[PDB]
From Swiss-Prot:
Regulation of protein activity: Inhibited in vitro by GRL-0617.
Subcellular location: Host endoplasmic reticulum membrane
Species the sequence originates in: Severe acute respiratory syndrome coronavirus 2
Assembly notes: May form homohexamers. Interacts with N protein.
Domain Macro residues, every copy: 1-167
Portion held of the full protein: 1025 to 1191 of 7096
Primary role: Responsible for the cleavages located at the N-terminus of the replicase polyprotein. Participates together with nsp4 in the assembly of virally-induced cytoplasmic double-membrane vesicles necessary for viral replication. Antagonizes innate immune induction of type I interferon by blocking the phosphorylation, dimerization and subsequent nuclear translocation of host IRF3. Also prevents host NF-kappa-B signaling. In addition, PL-PRO possesses a deubiquitinating/deISGylating activity and processes both 'Lys-48'- and 'Lys-63'-linked polyubiquitin chains from cellular substrates.
Impact noted for substituting S164L: In strain: Gamma/P.1
Catalysed reaction, written as an equation: Thiol-dependent hydrolysis of ester, thioester, amide, peptide and isopeptide bonds formed by the C-terminal Gly of ubiquitin (a 76-residue protein attached to proteins as an intracellular targeting signal)
Bilayer topology: Multi-pass membrane protein
Descriptive protein name: Papain-like protease nsp3
Amino acid sequence: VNSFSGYLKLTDNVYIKNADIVEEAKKVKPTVVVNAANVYLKHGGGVAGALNKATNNAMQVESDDYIATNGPLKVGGSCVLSGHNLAKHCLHVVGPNVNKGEDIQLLKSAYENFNQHEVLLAPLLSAGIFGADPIHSLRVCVDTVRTNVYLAVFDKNLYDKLVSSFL
Ligand SMILES: O[C@H]1CC[C@@H]2CCN(c3ncnc4[nH]ccc34)[C@@H]21
C-alpha cells in the first residue's frame, strides 16, 4: 500500500491520472520522481522546467555540477540525483526528442531505466515538447516497465484520450 490517490489502473503495475506532476510530487513526496530530461540536464521547459522551478533552481545547480563532472547523458540513459523538496530522488531520464531527429526506438531503452526502482511517479517520456505520440509512449511504458509506475498526464484532454484509446 502506498499514498498515491485517484489513479486509474491500466495493468498489474501501471497507473495513470490527469495531474500536474509538480503538485503530485509535493503532495506524495515519492521515493522517486522521474524528470523528462535532456542529455545536458538543461531544465528549461516542459516537465523539466516545471520541476526545476519548483526546486527554486536547486535542481539546475546540482545538474550543472553533475554535467561538469560526468559529461552529458546518453539518449535513452538516466542518472539519479536529489529530489530536493519534491521527492527523495529524481531519476532524470532522456527519451528521444523527435523535434531533434532522435530515434524513437530509443524510447524503450529510456523506459528500461524505470525498472531499477520499485515505485516511481513519472511523466510520459518523449511526449509533450519532445514531439512523440503520447499514445505510443504509453504503450511502450506498459510493455517495458515492470515496476510500479504512477503516470501523471498534465493535459486533461490528452488524459481522456489516452484512457479511451488504451488497449
Ligand atoms: O506527462 C507528460 C508527457 C508530455 C506532456 C507535456 C507536459 N507533461 C507534464 N505532465 C505532468 N505534469 C506536468 N507538469 C508540467 C508539465 C507536465 C506531459
